[PDB]
From a paper:
The ribosome was identified as the molecular target based on resistant mutant sequencing, and a cryo-EM structure revealed that myxovalargin binds within and completely occludes the exit tunnel, consistent with a mode of action to arrest translation during a late stage of translation initiation. To visualize the interactions of myxovalargins with the ribosome, we determined cryo-EM structures of MyxA in complex with the vacant E. coli 50S subunit at 2.10 Å as well as a MyxB-stalled ribosome complex (MyxB-SRC), at 2.96 Å. In both cases, additional density was observed within the NPET that could be unambiguously assigned to MyxA and MyxB, respectively. The overall conformation of myxovalargins on the ribosome is oriented with the MBA moiety positioned at the PTC and the AG extending down the NPET toward ribosomal protein L22.
Despite the lower resolution, the cryo-EM density of MyxB-SRC was well-resolved and suggested an analogous mode of interaction with the ribosome as MyxA, consistent with the high conservation in their chemical structures. Collectively, our toeprinting results are consistent with the previous finding that MyxB does not prevent binding of the fMet-tRNA at the P-site but rather interferes with binding of aminoacyl-tRNAs to the A-site. Indeed, in the MyxB-SRC, we observed the simultaneous presence of P-site tRNA and MyxB but no ribosomes with additional presence of A-site tRNA. However, careful examination of the MyxB-SRC revealed that while the acceptor arm of the P-site tRNA has accommodated on the large subunit, the terminal CCA-end is not fully accommodated at the PTC. Instead, the P-site tRNA is shifted by 1.5 Å when compared to a fully accommodated pre-attack state P-site tRNA and accommodation appears to be prevented due to direct steric clashes with MyxB, specifically, between the fMet moiety of the initiator tRNA and the IB and D-Val4 of MyxB. Indeed, the density for the P-site tRNA in the MyxB-SRC is consistent with an initiator fMet-tRNA; however, the CCA-end of the P-site tRNA is flexible, and thus, there is little to no density observed for the fMet moiety. Even if the fMet-tRNA were able to fully accommodate at the P-site, the IB and D-Val1 moieties of MyxB encroach on the A-site and would prevent accommodation of most, if not all, aminoacyl-tRNAs at the PTC. We note here that the only difference between MyxA and MyxB is the addition of two methyl groups on the IB moiety of MyxA, which we would predict occlude the A-site even further. Our toeprinting assays and structure of the MyxB-SRC lead us to propose a model for the mechanism of action of myxovalargins, namely, that they trap ribosomes during a late stage of translation initiation by preventing full accommodation of the initiator tRNA at the peptidyl-transferase center on the large ribosomal subunit.
Author numbering:
A (entry chain K): 2 to 272
B (entry chain k): 1 to 46
C (entry chain b): 1 to 93
The structure:
Amino acid sequence: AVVKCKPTSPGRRHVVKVVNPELHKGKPFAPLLEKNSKSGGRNNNGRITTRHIGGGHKQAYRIVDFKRNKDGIPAVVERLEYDPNRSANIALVLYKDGERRYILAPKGLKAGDQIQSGVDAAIKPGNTLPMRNIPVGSTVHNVEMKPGKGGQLARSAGTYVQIVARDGAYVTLRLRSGEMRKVEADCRATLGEVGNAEHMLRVLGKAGAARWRGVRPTVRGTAMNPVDHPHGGGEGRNFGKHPVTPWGVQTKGKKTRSNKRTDKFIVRRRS
Amino acid sequence: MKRTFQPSVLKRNRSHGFRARMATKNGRQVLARRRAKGRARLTVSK
Amino acid sequence: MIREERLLKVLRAPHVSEKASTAMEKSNTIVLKVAKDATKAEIKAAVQKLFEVEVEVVNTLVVKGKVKRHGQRIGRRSDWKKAYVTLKEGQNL
RNA sequence: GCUCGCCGGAAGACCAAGGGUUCCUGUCCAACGUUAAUCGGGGCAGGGUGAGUCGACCCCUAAGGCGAGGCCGAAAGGCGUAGUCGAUGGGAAACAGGUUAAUAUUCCUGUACUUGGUGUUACUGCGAAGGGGGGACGGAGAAGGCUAUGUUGGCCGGGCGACGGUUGUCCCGGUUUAAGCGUGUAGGCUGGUUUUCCAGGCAAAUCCGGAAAAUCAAGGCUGAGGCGUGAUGACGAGGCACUACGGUGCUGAAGCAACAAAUGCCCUGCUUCCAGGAAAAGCCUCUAAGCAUCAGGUAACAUCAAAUCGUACCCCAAACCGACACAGGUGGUCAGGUAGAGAAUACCAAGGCGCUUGAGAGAACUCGGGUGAAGGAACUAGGCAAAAUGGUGCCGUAACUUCGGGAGAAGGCACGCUGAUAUGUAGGUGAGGUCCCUCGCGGAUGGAGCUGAAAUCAGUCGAAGAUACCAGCUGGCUGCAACUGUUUAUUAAAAACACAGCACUGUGCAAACACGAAAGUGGACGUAUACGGUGUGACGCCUGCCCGGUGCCGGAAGGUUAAUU
RNA sequence: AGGACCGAACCGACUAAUGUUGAAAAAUUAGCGGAUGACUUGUGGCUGGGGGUGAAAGGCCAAUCAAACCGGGAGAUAGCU
Ligand SMILES: [Mg+2]
Ligand SMILES: [Mg+2]
Ligand SMILES: [Mg+2]
Ligand SMILES: [Mg+2]
Ligand SMILES: [Mg+2]
Ligand SMILES: [Mg+2]
Ligand SMILES: [Mg+2]
Ligand SMILES: [Mg+2]
Ligand SMILES: [Mg+2]
Ligand SMILES: [Mg+2]
Ligand SMILES: [Mg+2]
Ligand SMILES: [Mg+2]
Ligand SMILES: [Mg+2]
Ligand SMILES: [Mg+2]
Ligand SMILES: [Mg+2]
Ligand SMILES: [Mg+2]
Ligand SMILES: [Mg+2]
Ligand SMILES: [Mg+2]
Ligand SMILES: [Mg+2]
Ligand SMILES: [Mg+2]
Ligand SMILES: [Mg+2]
Ligand SMILES: [Mg+2]
Ligand SMILES: [Mg+2]
Ligand SMILES: [Mg+2]
Ligand SMILES: [Mg+2]
Ligand SMILES: [Mg+2]
Ligand SMILES: [Mg+2]
Ligand SMILES: [Mg+2]
Ligand SMILES: [Mg+2]
Ligand SMILES: [Mg+2]
Ligand SMILES: [Mg+2]
Ligand SMILES: [Mg+2]
Ligand SMILES: [Mg+2]
Ligand SMILES: [Mg+2]
């Protein structure tokens, strides 16, 4: 899929485009399509709460079924679609009752492959079972943190969570970050890994590509004035200060997690 | 040379009109002061 | 329908100019100054009852008041309404 | 009134925005007008804006706003649900001519159309706030079919020339016609149809989705333009009588074909690409309750309604924004001829203008230009400025390189006109005719006519043929930044900023973090191939040593150590 | 195909001159750069003052910016003129 572009102009020399020809080239499924208005990284107060977010291409939000609650009915992969909202590729599946739902396409779940959810489902890529019914060590993705809430772990691209162990009510999970988290065994998880693992091998190649994705230029704090950033500026390239955020908090090393409400679940922190 | 004032009736009324003034406590204080002073035109309203 | 009270107020006065006479003689249209709030249907009923003439169509235009002066102060004339009432074949003044 | 000059992708013509009577008429010239003014966007008076179909209003939603309750907050308030507003977007319908001093798709003439309402008759399953479909959508690109439009001929009317010639192979003008309705073509999409049957679309559904048979594939949908009608009309070059000399009436010929051709239409197409490309209603359809005589529905038909508001005029400007009748700024619409790749540019058309002080003179000097003996950067901070290069085809083109470049490198040759090839060719366009034919917007053939490069050969004129305008100067070595971008609006466009890439670090989701006394919101409807912060800044080769200090991370024995007691 | 190339519109603003009681409180004229894009543009919307927004210049936030403007405390205080 990784395909380098010939250097016919500056801006195309370094672009490394990942091309998957299985992806449906037509329009996406309309009944499961909503609107995704852009915010520019601004809140209900109009203030920029997150910097470097603005512009981009218009995107229609595809409603993805992260719960996988249609147990008992098999589904058939119809087309591996393209999702502009997520790193992975969605997959339109048709159930044996005539209902179409979008799911995060696993590694090699091509068209025609039959998927099933529920406790009765087989141990296959794309099948969703509760982690109590999944063998220890089985690589999964779209792991729910609460039963019935919907998957919220290992949903990016080529991401998966190995089931480290099973200790009754809870199951130890090795997340992509390297952290071992205890999640209830009732939570559902889809067998396999997320597809489109070549996503990391793409190279934007030019500043336009970043703007296409809706990322505005990042100004370094050292290039600003003392009033604009704690890094401020001196005569010439002057630093002489411990790296801090635009708000003064130490940036290189300082930990910031402060929950105490979820610490019990965490077994080991990512090294 | 483009100047600062670009007349737009819709925007003028939506920002300095009577209903915009009456929509807030501060805007009503503006009308009260203008009523107290005796301004013939209380707002830019039409 | 429209009370005769209403019909007796919608028509303010006949309009005298040069275009009005030309229209009155060529298009059989009597231009009449009407009330600002007089609608076309109101004007039709009024013309047919207070002039005994069958009317075909009424065209209404609102004439804005020209801002005159008194030589020292700026004043504005009030807006009036002009009604082009086309009589089918009735004759009048 | 005659010349003259200027603009003509404008300096013309329509608007939106904004303005607000500046419109047109009569009248006045104090002030306003950078001069005079008889004139004016000035004064004064009078007149002028006519709509079921254009626009608004209206129905529908976007960003967003307000927001019953609600949640939260000393108060004032904040946020947000049900809702309800909000266009810059979606949603019914009219065109040609004629007309006023001043409006016209609005008045008039001719011919249309839409959506409601009520009534008649025939007939009937009707019914949402629900369900489905549809509306409904990206960038670029490549065609072909076309039209607007232009050109040429033909045709019709006129003409026969202030100076040699001009009854023709001459000259000038005209040669225009719509909505609608009818047909349904180039093109585009799609198999069709029936039946049975079910975890879906919250319930239901004949609808949609699915599943399975059966049989047929030619039916459907959509679609420019053309033709027909509209149109026995309108309009029309231009005449003839009378003239408030402005006119006014009245009459009125041809009205065809060929070729060329859009950036417009078919095209919301089609092909391809990744950055993956509104919503809602109108609209079509399906059912949930009553009821099944009703009511509703449907088709035709008759009659009724379509209100209100805008409509003048300016609108790249003397009417808007700039204090000015200011050399500035201001979105959209149309897009003639010749030459040209062209919406460049030159010159013209339609149209509009000569910029509201003029008359002289022809000093220095200033400004804006033309030319220049010999020299040729000696000038100067610096070739600043100027001069020079400049088109097309073709031949030819180095180092270096990331194999794309460099490169239009450099350099050089041809170029006008005329004749022949070939009374205009190759190519394109295609009539008639002829045959076919499921007899049509059809097919085959065939070629009239029309248009039309380039090239070659020969000749010819000039000092010069890319002859004007228009239109790279080139090469060499080196610093910095990889590159396209960005910035100190109004002295700094850069080596600065950003940038793809790289790295460190944080962050397990009720994420970090950010704005918020809070609720809440962005991050993100994302989930560690993710996001935040920081540094560096493509690519290649790489990135050494030091943790004593400061910071951070980890660890806690023990010392110290607050409230509390 | 391309933040590809030349070049009008369009968007900018590198140089020169002019102008500097200007035609203009930033323009004109001859050149100049980009010109399918990280483009430009119409309408509406949104963020508010130690706040915003900033491809970062202390830039910009109505000819105003190392803390806008308006009103107020206010006749602040001036060993200074
Ligand atoms: Mg500094
Ligand atoms: Mg410095
Ligand atoms: Mg230094
Ligand atoms: Mg600095
Ligand atoms: Mg007056
Ligand atoms: Mg006059
Ligand atoms: Mg509404
Ligand atoms: Mg393409
Ligand atoms: Mg003679
Ligand atoms: Mg014919
Ligand atoms: Mg175009
Ligand atoms: Mg009306
Ligand atoms: Mg006008
Ligand atoms: Mg002027
Ligand atoms: Mg002006
Ligand atoms: Mg100009
Ligand atoms: Mg030109
Ligand atoms: Mg002049
Ligand atoms: Mg010389
Ligand atoms: Mg040069
Ligand atoms: Mg260096
Ligand atoms: Mg650079
Ligand atoms: Mg600057
Ligand atoms: Mg500058
Ligand atoms: Mg740097
Ligand atoms: Mg550097
Ligand atoms: Mg080291
Ligand atoms: Mg150039
Ligand atoms: Mg210029
Ligand atoms: Mg040049
Ligand atoms: Mg705006
Ligand atoms: Mg302040
Ligand atoms: Mg103050
Ligand atoms: Mg004082």
